[PDB]
Write a protein that binds this ligand. Structure first.
Ligand SMILES: C[C@@H]1O[C@@H](O)[C@@H](O)[C@H](O)[C@@H]1O
Ligand SMILES: C[C@@H]1O[C@@H](O)[C@@H](O)[C@H](O)[C@@H]1O
Ligand SMILES: C[C@@H]1O[C@@H](O)[C@@H](O)[C@H](O)[C@@H]1O
Ligand SMILES: C[C@@H]1O[C@H](O)[C@@H](O)[C@H](O)[C@@H]1O
Ligand SMILES: C[C@@H]1O[C@H](O)[C@@H](O)[C@H](O)[C@@H]1O
Ligand SMILES: C[C@@H]1O[C@H](O)[C@@H](O)[C@H](O)[C@@H]1O
Ligand SMILES: C[C@@H]1O[C@H](O)[C@@H](O)[C@H](O)[C@@H]1O
Ligand SMILES: C[C@@H]1O[C@H](O)[C@@H](O)[C@H](O)[C@@H]1O
Ligand SMILES: C[C@@H]1O[C@H](O)[C@@H](O)[C@H](O)[C@@H]1O
Ligand SMILES: C[C@@H]1O[C@H](O)[C@@H](O)[C@H](O)[C@@H]1O
Lengths: 312, 312
């Protein structure tokens, strides 16, 4: 056994670095703490233990994370929900983990809401633009809401009509160019887009099992988009855009069918051109991943440590 | 979601009472506490909350329980393993929960050992005779060991050669007449017997999936034995003895196939003539039970509450 909370949500980030790509993955432990595990290049995963707590949230809190580089180092933001269902934020400010300012706004979320977040523009010489996506209601047909950071937090848009407690994936495919993926009331994955001055319904859609967990990534100038969804104990699916949308396909290992446990979640990260990780929760209870190795294909990578309870 | 630890072991007891059957079920929460839920007759289950803690054990501790009536009320003993893999006991003494004497003995238990217990003889006018079954090693081919209460704790027998971390069911089919069920290295359920002065290999055997959880009950003068096994996300099996063994069969609901989650455990109780519950862990994470209802048959009964975390 491990200290990984069964049906914990997961969030993950990645950035390229001279010694090998840096990854961080966030997950909840049995005590409600949010833990971090770390990977540098292809070196074994580290962290994931009681010594790697970055914050706390309500048990079974949704999670989302973004990162950028600033003049003060690596910035990370981890979004979660407290025990009063207030949207909250933990900040890695380049040196330490602290509580961010979002919590003080007092944004109320639906108890079963998922979370997604994206960022663009932040650098050594430019401020970040963050968008956090959540829902206020657990009911079927509810909208997705957006919180906006540009120098301060303000309410953003609301759109869509979703499956109850829909999964949400969010990616900035270019500067101020946003794609949000969610499950509609008819269980289709749908796409909401912002290019310049308005939200509009995108051309992407895909039938999926009710209650899938959804992630989305993008890279490059093409741009390239990947949308992932998975129902626990079913296989992972990927839709790919590089100018058109393909027919979605399963990512799977014939020797290890349907490795995720029921009612679990996924997260994705990416960096370079291109490395991708798609995290999932399996027997153990283990934090696993699918990895795309750029010229080899998909495989299940090294298991991410998530603690070992006393007496084991 | 609930506060029921996923892959918690379970233990259950039952007795006849005026007003109807009394049942108690024991399970672990996310904090490693052992909680109790209660049922009287066919009224709703009660308990299962943070206010119903009876003890604590290592996370993912195995569990077993026995009960009898005494002059000072209902006696319950719950067996578990502490964080140092020492066999430990919680006592309901007719009025309150306290720590029992067994822990002071220092009986070391394999980290992945299961536990079973049986009792006979205890009454308002006679002392209990308790037997606890456990393993010292996790390895395939290990024996089952026995601890004995006869007014004090002493080491009893060891026997068998088991599947690694086998399930164990234990039942007293008559006064001082014991039947122990476990999974052997060929994955057959097998039976060890004590009638008078020695342990011997019983006639019962049955093929089963690798790594099943096992429980056993008995009643009456025939006597009647029921042995249960289940691999998580497969159906429950029952073998039945009424003078001879039947062909084991599934207990299942065609409208709710394989309701248990992977890698989970069962427990069984019985009392009267004849009431039986077989507990299992399902999505929720919920504590469920199969119920044997005379003249109706088997069905999934009312859900047992196991807490609701803050924010839900
Ligand atoms: C980019 C901003 O950084 C800090 O000021 C946080 O307190 C804010 O909530 C936001 O994440
Ligand atoms: C990048 C593309 O932008 C719009 O054309 C959408 O309709 C597509 O689905 C895709 O997101
Ligand atoms: C009550 C019966 O006792 C012995 O005959 C065993 O061999 C049987 O399997 C059964 O347990
Ligand atoms: C960017 C920082 O990397 C360091 O290695 C980690 O210890 C911090 O938690 C954070 O992820
Ligand atoms: C990129 C756009 O920025 C704006 O401030 C928001 O109001 C829109 O919803 C969108 O996020
Ligand atoms: C990066 C790789 O892109 C390819 O075209 C896809 O087929 C793979 O699944 C993966 O997303
Ligand atoms: C026999 C006793 O029943 C009481 O109602 C319960 O509160 C105790 O925990 C115990 O099970
Ligand atoms: C029968 C005995 O009752 C006592 O209260 C316990 O302390 C012993 O361990 C044993 O269970
Ligand atoms: C009923 C028998 O009681 C004895 O004391 C023990 O030595 C045996 O193993 C068995 O439990
Ligand atoms: C008590 C009942 O006995 C019958 O003989 C069996 O068929 C049922 O499964 C159940 O155990």
């Amino acid at each position: 056994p491990t200290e990984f909370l069964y049906t914990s949500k997961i969030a993950a980030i990645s950035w390229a670095a001279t010694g090998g790509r840096q990854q961080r993955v966030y997950f909840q432990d049995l005590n409600g703490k949010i833990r971090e595990a770390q990977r540098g290049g292809d070196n074994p995963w580290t962290g994931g233990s009681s010594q790697n707590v970055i914050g706390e949230a309500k048990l079974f809190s949704p999670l989302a994370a973004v990162t950028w580089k600033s003049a003060q180092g690596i910035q990370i933001r981890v979004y979660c929900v407290n025990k009063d269902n207030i949207l909250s934020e933990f900040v890695y400010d380049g040196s330490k983990w602290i509580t961010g300012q979002l919590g003080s706004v007092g944004v109320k979320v639906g108890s079963n809401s998922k979370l997604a977040a994206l960022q663009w523009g932040g650098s050594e010489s430019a401020p970040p633009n963050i968008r956090v996506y959540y829902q206020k209601s657990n009911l079927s047909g509810s909208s997705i809401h957006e919180y906006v950071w540009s120098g301060k937090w303000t309410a953003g848009a609301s759109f869509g009509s979703t499956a109850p407690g829909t999964g949400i994936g969010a990616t900035a495919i270019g500067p101020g160019r946003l794609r949000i993926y969610y499950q509609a009331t008819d269980n289709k994955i749908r796409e909401h887009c912002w290019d310049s001055n308005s939200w509009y319904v995108g051309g992407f859609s895909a039938s999926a099992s009710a209650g899938v967990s959804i992630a989305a990534i993008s890279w490059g100038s093409t741009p390239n988009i990947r949308v992932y969804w998975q129902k626990g104990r079913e296989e992972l699916y990927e839709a790919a855009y590089g100018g058109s949308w393909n027919t979605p396909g399963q990512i799977k290992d014939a020797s290890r069918p349907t490795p995720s446990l029921p009612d679990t979640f996924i997260a994705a990260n990416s960096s370079g051109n291109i490395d991708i990780s798609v995290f999932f929760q399996a027997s153990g209870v283990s934090l696993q991943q699918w990895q795309w190795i750029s010229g080899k294909g998909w495989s299940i990578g090294a298991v991410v440590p998530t603690g070992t309870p006393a007496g084991w």
